[PDB]
């Protein structure tokens, strides 16, 4: 069985922070921590009031002159568990059941004879940022893959979920063909948002608290806007129709060609700058150049377009299309398009009735993985 590298999506791996802040927004916020502590996921930090301290620490500060993000003053952040799997398996380490993500898949791999940190390793990253600001991650990824090839005597299978697929595609596009041919056995793509997703618009406009219902959407919106990864996942014209209307308000429409207006109108000009920085990172048409298995969920209502009665401080009415609940079905066209441009094999696999996250622990998904690894 070949070695395996797991790549998480947005919000998909733990993050740690250390504090020595000059000042804070409220007296009850900690100025200093003695060591690094879990910033994501920690449910205790997401309660009302305390949320303001958390936002103050986890937000990214955009420098308009340098066109780059910085951490808040006195705040440092690291990605734990690179080369291990604990940070991908459970999001909140203290809070077992509720935070289960990659756990089920990893347990199955172990059942088939794999070993944590050895045959199977995770590649977590700072998912708040785009690939442009995770250069070190990609260096470590390349080196880890080479090490696993040497140790275990064979090329690696990449298994990526959601945004992890875009990160890994960027990575693969930048490696020479000879390297990919030697070191990569296959790339298993799970729920990949090729060409962005509709839900991005709602998040940016009015906030999205589906997971965190105890907190108001307009409060959490502040943090969500700050993450470059959010703006990076706005719909792209090669997958969606250039004329498709995503957002309707009482005064105006918004298509994918109206992002500048959108950002100005919602009062977040930084987001336009973020989008300009990142929209050109991944070459739309260039395939990864390796054996690809594209798994996508269907039959789950997925937000397609939005009507705002009041813009942008009031929650919108939502029209639904097909997909996995998060990633729109229309994303799977890119895999379809790559199939016709094939040196390497491209296999498409529908997962009817499988939700975006549930697919990672689904028996059918695991059975397909078995096929790839042992066949
Ligand atoms: C955003 O990032 C930019 C670029 O890194 C920062 O630019 C700052 O600009 C000042 C001058 O306006 C820099 O000071 C000058 O440095 C040059 C050497 O290149 C020297 O010849 C001058 O005498 C002067 O000292 C400053 O170094 C630089 N600030 C930095 C690097 O922190 C800008 O400050 C950043 N903005 C924020 C809010 O972080
Ligand atoms: C999509 O956007 C890019 C960048 O603006 C542009 O080069 C390309 O022509 C666009 N596709 C269209 C207009 O169909
Ligand atoms: C958006 O465009 C469509 C098609 O041109 C039009 O029917 C509609 O009136 C527009 N919506 C708004 C809110 O202006
Ligand atoms: C797994 O997928 C099957 C069919 O693909 C679906 O019927 C089922 O609801 C899913 N179950 C879980 C636990 O994800």
Swiss-Prot record:
What modifications does the entry list under PTM / processing?
A: N-glycosylated. N-glycosylation is important for maturation of the enzyme and normal subcellular location.
* Keywords recorded for this protein, A-Z: Acyltransferase, Disulfide bond, Fatty acid metabolism, Glycoprotein, Hydrolase, Lipid degradation, Lipid metabolism, Lysosome, Membrane, Metal-binding, Secreted, Signal, Transferase, Zinc
- Please give, as recorded in its UniProt entry, the membrane topology of this protein: Peripheral membrane protein
| Positions annotated with a glycan in the UniProt record | 63, 237, 253, 362
Look up the EC number in the record and give it: 2.3.1.-, 3.1.1.32, 3.1.1.4, 3.1.1.5
Per the UniProt entry, the disulfide pairs are 29-53
Binding site residues for substrate: 10, 163
Please list the residues that bind Zn(2+): 162, 304, 319, 356
Q: Which family does it belong to?
A: Belongs to the AB hydrolase superfamily. Lipase family.
This protein is called: Lysosomal phospholipase A and acyltransferase
Please name the taxonomic classification of the source: Eukaryota, Metazoa, Chordata, Craniata, Vertebrata
